[PDB]
C-alpha cells in the first residue's frame, strides 16, 4: 500500500521497505568477493559487459579513495560513485585537518553514516549499492562492507552479488591466516570463473585490486598478467 513508498515509514512490524527494496538492487548485481591476507586485502569483481565494443577499463567498479584505501562498490554503479566521491572527501579531511591518514575502521564508519542519512528523510532514497572498503592503515589490513541500511561490519572475507551464497562457501575453504596476497589473486579470480555462468551473458571479465606490503602499502590495480586466464 502506502507503507512502502518512502523511507520515513516504519511498517506494522518495524521494518523499512525502501531500504530492503534497495537491498534487492545489490542482490541482482554482479558478483563481488574479497579476502584479508594477513599483510593486506585483495578485492575482485566481475564486470558484466553488455556489448563487445566496450573499451578495456570501462565501468571499473574499483576506485581508489586514499593512497592506502579504496572502495569497490557492488550494486548500482552511479549510486556508488556518490559514495566514492563522499569517502574521498572524508579522507581528504583527515589529511588536510588532522595531518594523518584515515584509519580503516574510521573511513568505513563515515561511509555507513552517509548511507544511513539518506534512509531517514522523506525526500531521499537509499543507495542501491554495497560498498566494500579495503584499507591498510596504521591499524593493519581492514576489510569492511557497508550495506544500503548503513550497517558496517569488519569481515575476513565477503561475497556480494547474485551468487553470493555459492561464493561464500568457496571462501570457507581458504585460510585467511596463512593466506598471502601472492596466491589469493589466483584463488579469488578462480572463484568468479566457477561461481558465474556464461549461459546468461557472453562478455564477462574480472577486475582485481589489492593493497599490501609488496605494493608499498598503496592501493593499486593489478598488472594485467597476474590474473588467471579463465
Amino acid at each position: 500500500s502506502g507503507h512502502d513508498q518512502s523511507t520515513d515509514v516504519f511498517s506494522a512490524e518495524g521494518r523499512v521497505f525502501q531500504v530492503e527494496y534497495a537491498g534487492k538492487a545489490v542482490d541482482n548485481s554482479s558478483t563481488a568477493v574479497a579476502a584479508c591476507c594477513k599483510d593486506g586485502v585483495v578485492v575482485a569483481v566481475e564486470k558484466v559487459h553488455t556489448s563487445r565494443m566496450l573499451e578495456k577499463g570501462s565501468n571499473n567498479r574499483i576506485h581508489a579513495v586514499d593512497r592506502q584505501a579504496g572502495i569497490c562498490i557492488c550494486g548500482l554503479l552511479p549510486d556508488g560513485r556518490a559514495i566514492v566521491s563522499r569517502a574521498r572527501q572524508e579522507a581528504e579531511n583527515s589529511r588536510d585537518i588532522f595531518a594523518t591518514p584515515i584509519r580503516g575502521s574510521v573511513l568505513a564508519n563515515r561511509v555507513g553514516e552517509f548511507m544511513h542519512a539518506y534512509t531517514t528523510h522523506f525526500a531521499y532514497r537509499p543507495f542501491g549499492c554495497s560498498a566494500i572498503i579495503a584499507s591498510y592503515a596504521d591499524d593493519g589490513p581492514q576489510l569492511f562492507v557497508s550495506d544500503p541500511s548503513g550497517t558496517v561490519a569488519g569481515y575476513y572475507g565477503v561475497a556480494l552479488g547474485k551468487a553470493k551464497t555459492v561464493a561464500k562457501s568457496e571462501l570457507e575453504k581458504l585460510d585467511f591466516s596463512s593466506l598471502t596476497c601472492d596466491e589469493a589473486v589466483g584463488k579469488l579470480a578462480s572463484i568468479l570463473h566457477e561461481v558465474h555462468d556464461k549461459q546468461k551473458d557472453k562478455l564477462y571479465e574480472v577486475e582485481v585490486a589489492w593493497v599490501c606490503d609488496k605494493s608499498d602499502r598503496k592501493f593499486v590495480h593489478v598488472p594485467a598478467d597476474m590474473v588467471p586466464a579463465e
Binding site: 585537518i97 588532522f98 595531518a99 594523518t100 584509519r103 574510521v106 596504521d138 591499524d139
Partner: protein, 229 residues
C-alpha cells in the same frame, strides 16, 4: 615570557616561567603557561594571554572529540596542525607564539614550534617568547643533544633561569613537566631556589665605582659610602 621545549630519547621536557605582565606591572606572578591538550601532549603559550587561551581550549576540544571518535591515541603532528590552521587564519587579529611538544607511541617525542607568523617547524628543541632571544647563544654553547630525562630537567631549569635574569618581561616561578611513556611528572621550583640569579652571582658583588670621593688624584678608589669619609 620565556618558553622552551627540549627533546630527549624518551620524550620531551616543557619549560616556562610564570608571569603575565600588563606592560610594566606584574598582574600575575604565578601564571601557568603549560597548557594541557591531551594527557601526553601539551603546549607552551606566549604572547597575548587571552588570544592564546582561546586557541588552546578550542584545539583541546577538537582534539578530545577526535580521540573519542578514533578510539586510539592522538599523534602530536595531529595537534600541531590544529594550531597552525588557527594561527594562520587569525594571524592579523591575534598575537600567538605557541610551542607544541608531546609524546605519541608512533613517533616518540615531538617538538613543534609555531611562531606568530603561523608557520609550523618540527624541531629537536624550540624557543619562544620575548625572553627567548637570550637563549640562542646559550644553547649554541652549553647544549649538547642526547641528554637523559634527569639531565634535561636540570638543564631547562637552568636555561629559563638565565632567561628571566636579564629579561624584564619574564620572571617568577619555573614550571617544568616531562611527557614520555610514563606518567607526566611536573615540577615547580621557586625563585629563591632557582639555579641562577644575578643577585647571588659572585661577579656582580662589587659595585661599579660611579660615586667617586672628591679627591686630589685621578686614582680611582671606589665609591663614597659615608659623608665623613
Amino acid at each position: 615570557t620565556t618558553i622552551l621545549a627540549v627533546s630527549y630519547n624518551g620524550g620531551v621536557v616543557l619549560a616556562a616561567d610564570s608571569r603575565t605582565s600588563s606592560g610594566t606591572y606584574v598582574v600575575n606572578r604565578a601564571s601557568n603557561k603549560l597548557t594541557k591538550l591531551t594527557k601526553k601532549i601539551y603546549c607552551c603559550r606566549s604572547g597575548s594571554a587571552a588570544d592564546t587561551q582561546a586557541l588552546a581550549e578550542r584545539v583541546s576540544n577538537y582534539l578530545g572529540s577526535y580521540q573519542t571518535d578514533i578510539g586510539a591515541g592522538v599523534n602530536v603532528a595531529t595537534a600541531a596542525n590544529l594550531f597552525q590552521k588557527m594561527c594562520y587564519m587569525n594571524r592579523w587579529n591575534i598575537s600567538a607564539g605557541i610551542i607544541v611538544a608531546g609524546y605519541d607511541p608512533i613517533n616518540g617525542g615531538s617538538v613543534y614550534s609555531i611562531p606568530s607568523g603561523g608557520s609550523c617547524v618540527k624541531l629537536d628543541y624550540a624557543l619562544g617568547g620575548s625572553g627567548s632571544i637570550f637563549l640562542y647563544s646559550f644553547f649554541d654553547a652549553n647544549y649538547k643533544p642526547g641528554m637523559s630525562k634527569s639531565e634535561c630537567v636540570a638543564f631547562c631549569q637552568r636555561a629559563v633561569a638565565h632567561a628571566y635574569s636579564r629579561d624584564g618581561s619574564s620572571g617568577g616561578l619555573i614550571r617544568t613537566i616531562t611527557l614520555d611513556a610514563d606518567e607526566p611528572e611536573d615540577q615547580t621550583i621557586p625563585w629563591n631556589r632557582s639555579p641562577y640569579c644575578m643577585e647571588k652571582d659572585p661577579k656582580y658583588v662589587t659595585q661599579a665605582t660611579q660615586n667617586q670621593p672628591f679627591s686630589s688624584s685621578a686614582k680611582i678608589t671606589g665609591n663614597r659610602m659615608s659623608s665623613t669619609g
